Tab-separated table of C-alpha atoms in Angstrom:
chain	number	residue	atom	x	y	z
A	1	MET	CA	-25.686	6.035	16.797
A	2	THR	CA	-22.392	7.798	18.939
A	3	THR	CA	-18.722	6.900	17.594
A	4	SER	CA	-18.743	3.915	20.458
A	5	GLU	CA	-22.150	2.913	18.963
A	6	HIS	CA	-20.949	2.035	15.252
A	7	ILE	CA	-17.425	0.520	16.706
A	8	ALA	CA	-19.996	-1.591	18.531
A	9	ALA	CA	-21.470	-2.190	15.462
A	10	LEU	CA	-18.706	-2.776	13.493
A	11	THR	CA	-17.145	-5.626	16.378
A	12	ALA	CA	-20.099	-7.439	15.858
A	13	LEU	CA	-19.567	-7.013	11.803
A	14	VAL	CA	-16.396	-8.635	12.516
A	15	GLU	CA	-17.467	-11.960	14.086
A	16	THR	CA	-20.140	-11.964	11.497
A	17	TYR	CA	-17.770	-11.903	8.859
A	18	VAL	CA	-15.107	-14.361	10.464
A	19	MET	CA	-18.035	-17.026	11.757
A	20	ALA	CA	-19.792	-16.593	8.352
A	21	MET	CA	-16.548	-17.567	6.444
A	22	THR	CA	-16.031	-19.999	8.498
A	23	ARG	CA	-18.749	-22.136	8.466
A	24	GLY	CA	-19.798	-21.146	4.451
A	25	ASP	CA	-23.012	-19.275	5.534
A	26	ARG	CA	-24.100	-17.209	2.169
A	27	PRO	CA	-26.630	-15.464	3.681
A	28	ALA	CA	-25.451	-14.049	6.358
A	29	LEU	CA	-22.184	-13.200	4.019
A	30	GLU	CA	-24.917	-11.609	1.843
A	31	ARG	CA	-25.885	-9.736	4.430
A	32	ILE	CA	-23.185	-8.077	5.473
A	33	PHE	CA	-20.829	-7.718	2.183
A	34	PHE	CA	-22.271	-5.167	-0.702
A	35	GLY	CA	-23.358	-7.624	-4.327
A	36	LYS	CA	-20.537	-5.590	-6.297
A	37	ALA	CA	-17.872	-5.625	-3.881
A	38	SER	CA	-14.990	-7.331	-3.929
A	39	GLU	CA	-12.125	-9.466	-2.599
A	40	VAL	CA	-8.609	-8.977	-3.671
A	41	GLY	CA	-5.105	-10.423	-3.306
A	42	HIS	CA	-2.393	-12.316	-4.172
A	43	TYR	CA	-2.782	-16.350	-3.791
A	44	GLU	CA	-0.601	-18.601	-4.702
A	45	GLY	CA	1.005	-15.930	-6.981
A	46	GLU	CA	-1.946	-15.358	-8.830
A	47	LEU	CA	-3.557	-11.690	-8.391
A	48	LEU	CA	-7.485	-12.999	-7.465
A	49	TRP	CA	-9.928	-10.392	-7.671
A	50	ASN	CA	-13.171	-12.431	-6.990
A	51	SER	CA	-17.137	-11.039	-6.815
A	52	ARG	CA	-18.685	-11.395	-3.684
A	53	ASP	CA	-20.801	-14.547	-5.549
A	54	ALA	CA	-17.510	-16.221	-5.698
A	55	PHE	CA	-15.817	-15.162	-2.653
A	56	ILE	CA	-18.374	-17.096	-1.190
A	57	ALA	CA	-18.698	-19.794	-2.836
A	58	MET	CA	-14.805	-20.771	-1.812
A	59	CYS	CA	-16.126	-20.402	1.786
A	60	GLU	CA	-18.671	-22.822	1.428
A	61	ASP	CA	-16.425	-25.198	-0.200
A	62	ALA	CA	-13.980	-24.978	2.481
A	63	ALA	CA	-16.489	-24.537	5.580
A	64	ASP	CA	-16.402	-26.344	8.171
A	65	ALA	CA	-19.224	-26.807	10.976
A	66	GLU	CA	-17.636	-27.330	14.298
A	67	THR	CA	-13.986	-25.437	13.844
A	68	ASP	CA	-13.646	-22.263	16.427
A	69	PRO	CA	-12.205	-19.226	14.038
A	70	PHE	CA	-8.854	-17.552	15.212
A	71	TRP	CA	-9.432	-13.812	14.819
A	72	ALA	CA	-8.569	-10.424	16.587
A	73	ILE	CA	-9.548	-6.788	15.522
A	74	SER	CA	-5.881	-4.964	14.426
A	75	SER	CA	-7.629	-1.249	13.971
A	76	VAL	CA	-10.990	-0.062	13.266
A	77	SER	CA	-11.601	3.692	11.634
A	78	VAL	CA	-14.387	5.492	11.264
A	79	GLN	CA	-14.933	9.269	9.300
A	80	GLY	CA	-18.815	9.825	9.514
A	81	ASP	CA	-20.340	6.817	7.871
A	82	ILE	CA	-17.074	5.176	5.953
A	83	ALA	CA	-14.995	3.103	8.646
A	84	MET	CA	-11.716	1.185	7.614
A	85	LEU	CA	-10.502	-2.383	9.290
A	86	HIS	CA	-8.063	-4.595	9.951
A	87	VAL	CA	-8.510	-7.739	11.054
A	88	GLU	CA	-6.214	-10.787	12.081
A	89	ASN	CA	-7.818	-13.824	10.428
A	90	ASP	CA	-7.125	-17.629	10.180
A	91	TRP	CA	-8.818	-19.637	7.340
A	92	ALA	CA	-7.887	-22.809	5.433
A	93	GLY	CA	-4.612	-23.180	7.525
A	94	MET	CA	-2.945	-19.526	6.703
A	95	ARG	CA	-3.042	-16.580	8.588
A	96	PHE	CA	-4.203	-13.542	6.973
A	97	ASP	CA	-4.878	-9.655	7.095
A	98	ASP	CA	-7.821	-8.362	5.765
A	99	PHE	CA	-7.951	-4.605	4.929
A	100	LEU	CA	-12.088	-4.323	5.177
A	101	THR	CA	-13.533	-0.880	4.001
A	102	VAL	CA	-17.746	-0.349	5.005
A	103	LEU	CA	-19.683	1.460	4.040
A	104	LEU	CA	-22.992	2.936	6.886
A	105	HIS	CA	-25.718	2.489	4.931
A	106	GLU	CA	-29.634	2.116	5.632
A	107	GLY	CA	-28.873	1.438	8.465
A	108	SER	CA	-26.184	-0.776	8.946
A	109	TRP	CA	-22.605	-1.515	7.886
A	110	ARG	CA	-21.705	-3.399	4.205
A	111	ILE	CA	-18.381	-3.886	3.313
A	112	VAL	CA	-17.747	-1.989	0.117
A	113	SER	CA	-14.005	-3.440	-0.193
A	114	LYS	CA	-11.409	-6.176	1.011
A	115	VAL	CA	-7.667	-6.378	0.313
A	116	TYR	CA	-5.419	-9.236	1.877
A	117	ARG	CA	-2.186	-10.963	2.155
A	118	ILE	CA	-0.905	-14.298	3.466
A	119	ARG	CA	1.419	-13.978	5.813
B	1	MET	CA	-11.428	-10.121	27.594
B	2	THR	CA	-12.306	-10.980	24.006
B	3	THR	CA	-10.627	-9.094	21.147
B	4	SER	CA	-14.450	-7.751	20.878
B	5	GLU	CA	-14.719	-6.955	24.074
B	6	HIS	CA	-10.696	-5.099	24.080
B	7	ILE	CA	-12.079	-2.925	21.831
B	8	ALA	CA	-15.313	-2.284	24.227
B	9	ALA	CA	-13.082	-2.193	27.024
B	10	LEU	CA	-11.354	0.455	25.203
B	11	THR	CA	-14.362	2.308	23.713
B	12	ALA	CA	-15.549	2.963	27.085
B	13	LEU	CA	-11.953	3.811	28.488
B	14	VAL	CA	-12.419	6.684	25.616
B	15	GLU	CA	-16.132	7.185	27.607
B	16	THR	CA	-14.251	7.603	30.807
B	17	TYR	CA	-11.823	10.104	30.334
B	18	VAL	CA	-14.011	12.608	27.621
B	19	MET	CA	-16.082	13.136	30.860
B	20	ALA	CA	-13.877	12.720	33.725
B	21	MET	CA	-11.869	15.739	31.965
B	22	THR	CA	-15.307	17.725	31.297
B	23	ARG	CA	-16.284	17.541	35.240
B	24	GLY	CA	-12.853	17.456	36.311
B	25	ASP	CA	-13.521	13.723	38.378
B	26	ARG	CA	-9.856	13.299	40.017
B	27	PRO	CA	-10.537	9.826	40.777
B	28	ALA	CA	-11.294	8.530	37.539
B	29	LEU	CA	-8.856	10.119	35.651
B	30	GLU	CA	-6.365	8.593	38.042
B	31	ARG	CA	-8.008	5.296	37.914
B	32	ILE	CA	-7.300	5.827	33.524
B	33	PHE	CA	-4.072	7.458	33.833
B	34	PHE	CA	-0.479	5.611	35.039
B	35	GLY	CA	0.633	7.532	36.929
B	36	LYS	CA	4.183	8.349	35.146
B	37	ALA	CA	1.344	9.477	32.265
B	38	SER	CA	2.105	12.702	30.223
B	39	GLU	CA	0.140	15.024	28.451
B	40	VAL	CA	1.628	17.228	25.698
B	41	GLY	CA	0.804	19.325	23.492
B	42	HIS	CA	1.205	23.536	22.542
B	43	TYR	CA	-0.025	25.603	23.627
B	44	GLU	CA	-0.394	29.693	22.639
B	45	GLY	CA	3.501	28.370	20.495
B	46	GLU	CA	4.510	26.710	24.466
B	47	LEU	CA	4.851	23.545	24.942
B	48	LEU	CA	3.597	21.792	27.533
B	49	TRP	CA	4.521	19.167	29.349
B	50	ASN	CA	1.787	17.888	32.057
B	51	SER	CA	1.928	14.676	34.896
B	52	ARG	CA	-1.487	13.436	35.641
B	53	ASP	CA	-1.676	15.317	38.853
B	54	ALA	CA	-0.468	18.901	36.055
B	55	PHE	CA	-3.000	17.958	33.250
B	56	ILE	CA	-5.637	16.797	36.235
B	57	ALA	CA	-5.481	20.087	38.084
B	58	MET	CA	-6.427	21.902	34.466
B	59	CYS	CA	-9.052	19.194	34.085
B	60	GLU	CA	-10.210	20.277	37.865
B	61	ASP	CA	-9.713	24.064	36.909
B	62	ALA	CA	-11.930	23.859	33.954
B	63	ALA	CA	-14.404	21.563	34.924
B	64	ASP	CA	-18.319	22.260	33.538
B	65	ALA	CA	-21.016	19.926	35.694
B	66	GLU	CA	-23.515	20.686	33.348
B	67	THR	CA	-22.446	20.490	29.286
B	68	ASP	CA	-23.022	17.557	27.574
B	69	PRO	CA	-19.133	17.545	25.666
B	70	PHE	CA	-18.659	16.280	21.711
B	71	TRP	CA	-16.410	13.743	21.288
B	72	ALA	CA	-15.483	10.793	18.461
B	73	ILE	CA	-13.497	7.959	18.174
B	74	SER	CA	-11.282	8.420	14.758
B	75	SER	CA	-9.632	5.128	15.081
B	76	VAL	CA	-8.903	2.601	17.627
B	77	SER	CA	-5.832	-0.067	17.224
B	78	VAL	CA	-4.778	-3.344	19.510
B	79	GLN	CA	-1.464	-5.147	19.374
B	80	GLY	CA	-1.676	-7.967	22.099
B	81	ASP	CA	-1.944	-5.859	25.339
B	82	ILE	CA	-1.009	-2.200	23.846
B	83	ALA	CA	-3.474	-0.162	21.817
B	84	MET	CA	-3.611	3.279	19.969
B	85	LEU	CA	-6.513	5.967	20.038
B	86	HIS	CA	-7.457	8.994	17.968
B	87	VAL	CA	-9.948	10.427	19.736
B	88	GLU	CA	-11.595	13.891	18.532
B	89	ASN	CA	-12.876	16.488	22.037
B	90	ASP	CA	-13.787	19.537	22.690
B	91	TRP	CA	-12.291	21.717	26.095
B	92	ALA	CA	-12.413	24.498	27.361
B	93	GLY	CA	-14.059	26.194	23.803
B	94	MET	CA	-11.373	24.465	22.268
B	95	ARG	CA	-11.100	20.766	19.743
B	96	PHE	CA	-8.715	19.251	20.270
B	97	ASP	CA	-7.136	15.794	18.457
B	98	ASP	CA	-6.064	13.868	21.014
B	99	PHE	CA	-3.478	10.866	20.558
B	100	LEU	CA	-3.426	8.322	23.137
B	101	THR	CA	-1.465	4.790	23.962
B	102	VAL	CA	-2.921	2.872	27.170
B	103	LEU	CA	-1.134	-0.677	27.916
B	104	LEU	CA	-3.562	-2.807	29.359
B	105	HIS	CA	-2.760	-4.170	33.226
B	106	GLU	CA	-4.076	-6.325	35.798
B	107	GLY	CA	-6.739	-6.081	33.790
B	108	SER	CA	-7.429	-2.382	33.144
B	109	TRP	CA	-6.402	-0.774	29.690
B	110	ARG	CA	-4.931	2.602	31.677
B	111	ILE	CA	-3.259	5.200	29.431
B	112	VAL	CA	0.313	5.956	29.452
B	113	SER	CA	1.332	8.980	27.208
B	114	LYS	CA	-1.829	11.863	25.552
B	115	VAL	CA	-0.591	13.999	23.071
B	116	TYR	CA	-2.844	16.324	21.048
B	117	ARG	CA	-3.211	19.287	19.159
B	118	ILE	CA	-5.284	22.365	19.373
B	119	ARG	CA	-7.132	23.088	15.670
C	1	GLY	CA	4.037	25.340	6.080
C	2	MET	CA	5.066	22.064	5.529
C	3	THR	CA	2.803	19.268	3.730
C	4	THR	CA	1.668	15.851	5.383
C	5	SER	CA	3.903	13.915	2.926
C	6	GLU	CA	7.172	15.926	4.266
C	7	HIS	CA	6.274	15.059	7.731
C	8	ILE	CA	5.661	11.515	7.285
C	9	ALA	CA	8.966	11.291	5.111
C	10	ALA	CA	10.504	13.157	8.462
C	11	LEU	CA	8.429	10.015	10.416
C	12	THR	CA	9.685	7.823	8.209
C	13	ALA	CA	13.222	9.048	8.896
C	14	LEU	CA	12.804	9.036	12.956
C	15	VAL	CA	11.949	5.691	12.304
C	16	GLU	CA	14.808	4.660	10.853
C	17	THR	CA	16.903	6.607	12.961
C	18	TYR	CA	15.165	5.109	16.322
C	19	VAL	CA	15.541	1.422	14.903
C	20	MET	CA	19.308	1.893	14.268
C	21	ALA	CA	20.451	3.860	17.216
C	22	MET	CA	18.715	0.934	19.669
C	23	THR	CA	20.513	-1.794	17.532
C	24	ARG	CA	24.121	0.032	17.725
C	25	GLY	CA	23.672	1.687	21.476
C	26	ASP	CA	24.103	5.009	20.150
C	27	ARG	CA	23.921	7.409	23.069
C	28	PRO	CA	23.800	10.736	21.444
C	29	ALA	CA	21.448	9.646	18.433
C	30	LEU	CA	19.091	8.290	21.029
C	31	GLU	CA	19.382	11.598	23.703
C	32	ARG	CA	18.079	13.681	20.379
C	33	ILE	CA	15.583	11.575	19.461
C	34	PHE	CA	13.317	10.998	22.488
C	35	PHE	CA	12.320	14.489	25.157
C	36	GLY	CA	14.400	14.029	28.270
C	37	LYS	CA	11.207	13.274	30.072
C	38	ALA	CA	10.298	10.728	27.495
C	39	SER	CA	8.919	6.882	28.830
C	40	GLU	CA	9.659	3.472	27.388
C	41	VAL	CA	6.587	0.917	29.081
C	42	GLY	CA	5.355	-2.585	28.254
C	43	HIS	CA	5.156	-6.460	29.971
C	44	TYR	CA	8.658	-7.776	30.585
C	45	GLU	CA	8.883	-10.848	31.874
C	46	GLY	CA	5.338	-11.029	33.311
C	47	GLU	CA	5.958	-7.217	34.997
C	48	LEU	CA	5.584	-3.766	34.161
C	49	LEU	CA	8.553	-1.709	33.286
C	50	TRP	CA	8.407	2.101	32.529
C	51	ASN	CA	11.718	3.111	31.815
C	52	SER	CA	13.207	6.789	31.951
C	53	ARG	CA	15.334	7.922	28.980
C	54	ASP	CA	18.385	7.667	31.145
C	55	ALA	CA	17.245	3.824	32.632
C	56	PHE	CA	16.120	2.398	27.961
C	57	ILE	CA	19.118	4.194	27.160
C	58	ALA	CA	21.309	1.899	29.016
C	59	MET	CA	19.499	-1.437	28.626
C	60	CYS	CA	20.353	0.247	24.216
C	61	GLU	CA	23.471	0.435	25.685
C	62	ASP	CA	23.703	-3.553	27.137
C	63	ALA	CA	22.415	-4.590	24.221
C	64	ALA	CA	24.512	-2.925	21.130
C	65	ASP	CA	25.850	-4.443	17.969
C	66	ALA	CA	27.909	-2.961	15.883
C	67	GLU	CA	26.701	-4.427	12.785
C	68	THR	CA	23.545	-6.713	12.522
C	69	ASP	CA	21.047	-5.381	10.166
C	70	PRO	CA	17.838	-4.927	12.302
C	71	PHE	CA	14.600	-6.094	10.737
C	72	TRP	CA	12.102	-3.219	10.794
C	73	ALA	CA	8.567	-2.021	9.674
C	74	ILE	CA	6.183	1.202	9.881
C	75	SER	CA	2.638	-0.961	9.734
C	76	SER	CA	1.318	2.594	10.219
C	77	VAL	CA	1.543	6.179	10.863
C	78	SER	CA	-1.096	9.060	11.906
C	79	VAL	CA	-0.281	12.626	11.851
C	80	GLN	CA	-2.801	15.284	12.296
C	81	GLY	CA	-0.989	18.777	12.656
C	82	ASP	CA	2.356	19.200	15.055
C	83	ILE	CA	1.613	15.495	16.903
C	84	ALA	CA	1.362	11.779	15.139
C	85	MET	CA	1.447	8.336	15.842
C	86	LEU	CA	3.264	5.856	14.581
C	87	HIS	CA	3.171	1.396	14.887
C	88	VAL	CA	6.513	0.070	14.389
C	89	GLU	CA	7.411	-3.813	14.154
C	90	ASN	CA	10.894	-4.197	15.039
C	91	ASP	CA	13.577	-6.733	16.447
C	92	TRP	CA	15.712	-6.028	18.744
C	93	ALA	CA	18.050	-8.775	21.393
C	94	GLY	CA	16.653	-11.453	19.723
C	95	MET	CA	12.854	-10.939	20.354
C	96	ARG	CA	9.894	-9.373	17.379
C	97	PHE	CA	7.889	-6.382	18.885
C	98	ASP	CA	4.794	-4.315	18.055
C	99	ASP	CA	6.178	-0.216	19.399
C	100	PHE	CA	3.362	2.473	19.648
C	101	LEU	CA	5.175	5.391	19.487
C	102	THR	CA	3.544	9.333	19.747
C	103	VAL	CA	5.450	11.726	18.444
C	104	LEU	CA	5.440	15.847	18.316
C	105	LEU	CA	6.536	17.776	15.309
C	106	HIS	CA	8.975	20.953	17.991
C	107	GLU	CA	11.255	23.230	16.828
C	108	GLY	CA	11.523	22.399	13.516
C	109	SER	CA	11.892	18.371	13.943
C	110	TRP	CA	10.474	15.383	15.342
C	111	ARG	CA	10.330	13.617	18.882
C	112	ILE	CA	9.423	10.921	20.436
C	113	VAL	CA	7.280	11.019	23.282
C	114	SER	CA	6.509	8.006	24.503
C	115	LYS	CA	6.876	4.044	23.223
C	116	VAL	CA	4.808	1.490	24.493
C	117	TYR	CA	5.460	-1.753	23.157
C	118	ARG	CA	4.468	-5.348	23.463
C	119	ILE	CA	6.920	-8.774	22.627
C	120	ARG	CA	5.466	-11.282	20.143
D	1	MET	CA	11.967	-1.186	-2.251
D	2	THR	CA	12.310	-0.552	1.409
D	3	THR	CA	10.295	-0.259	4.276
D	4	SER	CA	11.094	3.744	3.459
D	5	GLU	CA	10.564	3.876	-0.318
D	6	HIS	CA	7.186	1.734	0.878
D	7	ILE	CA	5.908	4.724	2.597
D	8	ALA	CA	7.326	7.122	0.413
D	9	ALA	CA	5.657	6.004	-2.828
D	10	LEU	CA	2.497	5.848	-1.507
D	11	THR	CA	2.344	9.612	0.027
D	12	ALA	CA	3.495	10.049	-3.671
D	13	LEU	CA	0.709	8.601	-4.810
D	14	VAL	CA	-1.926	10.484	-3.046
D	15	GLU	CA	-0.127	13.895	-4.314
D	16	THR	CA	-0.845	12.129	-7.941
D	17	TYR	CA	-3.941	11.170	-7.193
D	18	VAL	CA	-4.897	14.487	-6.212
D	19	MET	CA	-3.353	16.615	-8.288
D	20	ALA	CA	-4.514	13.887	-11.731
D	21	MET	CA	-8.603	14.249	-9.949
D	22	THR	CA	-7.839	18.212	-10.227
D	23	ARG	CA	-6.762	18.606	-13.475
D	24	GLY	CA	-8.801	15.709	-15.054
D	25	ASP	CA	-5.171	13.565	-16.216
D	26	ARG	CA	-7.003	10.153	-17.337
D	27	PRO	CA	-3.635	8.888	-18.417
D	28	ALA	CA	-2.328	9.405	-14.751
D	29	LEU	CA	-5.866	7.991	-12.730
D	30	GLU	CA	-5.974	5.135	-14.549
D	31	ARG	CA	-2.914	4.073	-13.754
D	32	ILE	CA	-2.672	4.166	-10.150
D	33	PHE	CA	-6.541	2.998	-10.318
D	34	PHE	CA	-6.901	-0.733	-11.309
D	35	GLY	CA	-9.530	-0.877	-14.046
D	36	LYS	CA	-11.715	-3.337	-12.003
D	37	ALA	CA	-11.583	-0.441	-8.904
D	38	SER	CA	-14.526	1.309	-7.507
D	39	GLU	CA	-15.212	4.848	-5.893
D	40	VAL	CA	-18.254	4.597	-4.077
D	41	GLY	CA	-19.871	7.090	-1.319
D	42	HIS	CA	-23.114	9.040	-0.505
D	43	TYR	CA	-23.324	11.843	-2.934
D	44	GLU	CA	-26.491	14.328	-2.351
D	45	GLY	CA	-28.733	11.495	-0.270
D	46	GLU	CA	-27.905	8.202	-2.833
D	47	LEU	CA	-25.280	5.663	-3.141
D	48	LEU	CA	-23.061	6.087	-5.611
D	49	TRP	CA	-20.947	3.648	-6.754
D	50	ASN	CA	-18.360	4.850	-9.933
D	51	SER	CA	-16.734	1.895	-11.863
D	52	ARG	CA	-13.152	3.231	-12.385
D	53	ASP	CA	-13.787	4.727	-16.307
D	54	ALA	CA	-17.233	6.527	-14.379
D	55	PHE	CA	-14.620	8.491	-11.990
D	56	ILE	CA	-12.225	9.697	-13.953
D	57	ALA	CA	-15.582	10.790	-16.567
D	58	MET	CA	-16.446	13.403	-13.188
D	59	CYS	CA	-13.174	14.318	-13.329
D	60	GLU	CA	-12.628	15.366	-16.732
D	61	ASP	CA	-16.206	17.228	-16.453
D	62	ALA	CA	-14.891	19.036	-12.824
D	63	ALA	CA	-11.279	19.520	-14.421
D	64	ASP	CA	-9.542	22.931	-13.382
D	65	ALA	CA	-6.204	23.459	-14.652
D	66	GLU	CA	-5.210	26.588	-12.656
D	67	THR	CA	-6.491	26.308	-8.930
D	68	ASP	CA	-3.420	24.102	-6.650
D	69	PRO	CA	-5.459	21.652	-4.241
D	70	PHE	CA	-6.527	21.258	-0.189
D	71	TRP	CA	-5.278	18.426	0.439
D	72	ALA	CA	-3.937	16.318	3.738
D	73	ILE	CA	-3.027	12.588	4.422
D	74	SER	CA	-4.288	11.649	7.637
D	75	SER	CA	-3.685	8.157	7.587
D	76	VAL	CA	-1.093	4.964	6.381
D	77	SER	CA	-0.791	1.769	7.220
D	78	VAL	CA	1.122	-1.015	5.508
D	79	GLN	CA	0.249	-4.934	5.931
D	80	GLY	CA	3.142	-6.772	3.334
D	81	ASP	CA	1.489	-5.729	-0.037
D	82	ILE	CA	-1.391	-4.224	1.065
D	83	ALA	CA	-2.433	-0.291	2.181
D	84	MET	CA	-4.675	1.295	3.713
D	85	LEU	CA	-4.703	5.696	3.394
D	86	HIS	CA	-6.866	8.836	4.505
D	87	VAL	CA	-6.721	11.351	2.828
D	88	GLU	CA	-9.027	14.274	3.256
D	89	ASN	CA	-8.804	16.643	-0.266
D	90	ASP	CA	-11.026	19.053	-1.330
D	91	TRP	CA	-13.244	18.885	-4.753
D	92	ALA	CA	-15.675	20.920	-6.715
D	93	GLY	CA	-16.239	22.975	-2.656
D	94	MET	CA	-16.465	20.342	-0.457
D	95	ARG	CA	-14.263	18.811	1.630
D	96	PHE	CA	-14.035	14.886	1.935
D	97	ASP	CA	-12.365	12.228	4.043
D	98	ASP	CA	-10.997	9.493	1.382
D	99	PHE	CA	-9.876	5.718	2.621
D	100	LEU	CA	-8.552	4.091	-0.126
D	101	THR	CA	-6.798	0.497	-0.556
D	102	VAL	CA	-4.164	-0.191	-2.268
D	103	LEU	CA	-2.307	-3.434	-3.234
D	104	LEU	CA	1.225	-3.724	-4.470
D	105	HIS	CA	1.139	-5.601	-7.419
D	106	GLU	CA	4.474	-6.424	-10.383
D	107	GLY	CA	5.732	-3.653	-8.418
D	108	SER	CA	3.651	-1.240	-7.660
D	109	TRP	CA	0.887	0.053	-5.485
D	110	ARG	CA	-2.472	0.706	-7.589
D	111	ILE	CA	-5.815	1.912	-6.075
D	112	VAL	CA	-8.418	-1.049	-5.523
D	113	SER	CA	-11.009	1.109	-4.179
D	114	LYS	CA	-11.851	4.592	-2.871
D	115	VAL	CA	-15.122	5.404	-0.395
D	116	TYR	CA	-15.531	8.634	0.898
D	117	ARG	CA	-17.801	10.874	2.860
D	118	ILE	CA	-18.507	14.250	2.640
D	119	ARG	CA	-17.814	16.404	5.109
């Protein structure tokens, strides 16, 4: 893969991610997040440190089969088999900035870490 | 154009830029760089501040019709109709880090400024 | 050689100087921090506005405010040798902007080459 | 802290991290990294997913009290209380690109994840 092809793959991963969150698509999220990955951020004053399972469970609870999510890729950085992404996304009526670290492992990009902040 | 489509359009822009530079393709470079765009950096300790015409003339002078040039996209950032790009590329036997700012105008991403350093 | 941390501190100072000089309509400060051939480019009122340093300094004078404490934030800073690119959020004349600045370390100091912006 | 102070705190964090790794300074590393933080990357063809403790242990094992580390900050990005840093750093005769995700929690910036690649 060229960096351009990797950037297209990373763009596709973001689209998969935002739609899977909105729809509560557990298999889709498990294919793009490592099992050891965490979702970390402040929510209602508390520091939340969610496992992949917990993160997905929250998406499933808040799932909506009709809403079209609103999102944008604000930044993508790539160095060899690692990448950084800044995604702007709406979820449960709030606007978030997601900072995602990703690793190309055995042919596909998987999220290692997700940190977010609510605007 | 969607958020994904702008990222793809910006990566296409980089490919066009690197190949047009290598090949000394004036038509392509004039389509992707605004007329008042500048290419700025140091060369042999001297500040080179090139107009688009000057920059393109240098590409024409050094043009290579056959080589497959090395290049990579290190980062792409977008806020509405503006973008920032970090591109690594080879030109005339030197390796460069290029920082480019771009504006989406009348449906086309066109480069406003290019600053570079020679490694 | 000077470290990347030291350069980032200098760029941070440059951004503060830039935002305050713009807000205050400080012509000497703006002429110091922007190269003579620098450009300010973006869409304004639906049209492409390509401003020379003389044009945008006159615009800063026009909208000058002697006392307002302007909002600004550095969203990103990237540095490679003697070049830098910065994403700055700032308020000016009642509007919020995202500015993408290209900067060059020249003769011992960081100086702005160009600024592209979009109004939120 | 002000916007300038936050940027300063983040570059200071990088300085602390790189020196602490070189010296095998466990107290420093435990202060700057969350306990649940992970260090992830490919190392000699395999995926290495280290806990903070496992990462600190390797630093201690390779500790050197005299070497002046070679490093550079390539980028710093901030959105509210989250940040991402791209740091170039030399360790054990190899050059790395480190992508760090950081969170401002209770007044200090601490590392949530460190993803890397070896050049």
